[PDB]
A paper describes a structure:
The [name] fold is not found in any modern protein, although its structure shares similarities with RIFT and OB. Thus, these ancient β-barrel folds (DPBB, RIFT, OB, and SH3) could be readily interconverted by a few feasible mutations through the missing-link fold, [name], indicating their significantly close evolutionary relationships.
Design-1 exhibited the metamorphic property, adapting two different folds, DPBB and [name]. Different ligand molecules probably induced the metamorphism in design-1. In the crystal structure of the DPBB-fold, two malonate ions bind to a positively charged pocket around the α1 helix, and are coordinated by Lys24, Arg27, and Lys33. Alternatively, in the crystal structure of design-1 with the [name] fold, two additional residues, Arg21, and Arg18’ from the other chain, coordinate the two sulfates. Its spectral pattern was slightly different compared to malonates, perhaps due to the difference in the DPBB- and [name]-folds. The changes in the CD spectrum patterns depending on the sulfate ions were also observed. These experiments demonstrated that the small ions mediate the folding of design-1, and their types may lead to two different structures.
Author numbering:
A (entry chain A), B (entry chain A): 1 to 43
Write the structure that this text describes.
Amino acid sequence: KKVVARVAEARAEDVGKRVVRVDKAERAKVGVKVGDVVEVKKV
Amino acid sequence: KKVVARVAEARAEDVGKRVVRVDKAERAKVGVKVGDVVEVKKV
C-alpha cells in the first residue's frame, strides 16, 4: 500500500540499512526539508 | 510533485545526507526490496 515516513539525516547507525536517498534538488522538487512527512509507494 | 527514486543500501558516504529510512517491515508492507523503484511524495 504505502509507507508513511519522515525525511531524516542519515546517521552512522544507518549504514548497511535500506534507505531512499533524497538529495537537495529532489527535496526542492517535492518541497520537503528534514523532518517532513512523505509517502513512499511502490511503482 | 513526486520524486522517483530507488531503495538503496546506505553507504558510509551517505552519513549526513537526507534519506527516508524504510525498515524490513515497511519493505514487506509495500512489497519492495533493495533496488526497487518507489515514488516519494510530500504529505
